[PDB]
Amino acid sequence: GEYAWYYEGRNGWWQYDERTSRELEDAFSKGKKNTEMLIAGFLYVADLENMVQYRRNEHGRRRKIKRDIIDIPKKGVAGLRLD
Ligand SMILES: Nc1ncnc2c1ncn2[C@@H]1O[C@H](COP(=O)(O)O)[C@@H](O)[C@H]1O[C@H]1O[C@H](COP(=O)(O)O)[C@@H](O)[C@H]1O
Numbered sequence: 855g856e857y858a859w860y861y862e863g864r865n866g867w868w869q870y871d872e873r874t875s876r877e878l879e880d881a882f883s884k885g886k887k888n889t890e891m892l893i894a895g896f897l898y899v900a901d902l903e904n905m906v907q908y909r910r911n912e913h914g915r916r917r918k919i920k921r922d923i924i925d926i927p928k929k930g931v932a933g934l935r936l937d
Pocket residue numbers: 861862863864865866868870871893908909913914915916917929932933934
């Protein structure tokens with residue numbers, strides 16, 4: 855039973871990078887309703903009640919997030935395609 859964090863792409867799921875995934879897991883484990891993440895130098899909000907992420911300070915997409923097993927189909931990790 856091993857788990858990872860994922861964010862929605864247009865037609866699939868991407869796994870979060872290792873550091874961010876650990877931060878999400880910490881926040882989830884403490885019962886936090888939300889947390890902030892640094893993604894490529896930009897601040898994002900992870901809303902753990904509604905299970906969505908979005909950029910903190912400027913416009914962007916709302917992406918679904920989920921916590922699921924490692925052994926699911928996925929597109930890659932943090933924008934780096936699996937080959
Ligand atoms: N948690 C994250 N980790 C890495 N990159 C991210 C993340 N959140 C946003 N970005 C990137 O930040 C940009 C703006 O996202 P927005 O509007 O939400 O703030 C996007 O390019 C985001 O990257 C995604 O989309 C790419 C295409 O994936 P397809 O739809 O073809 O599956 C792919 O690189 C994928 O990683």
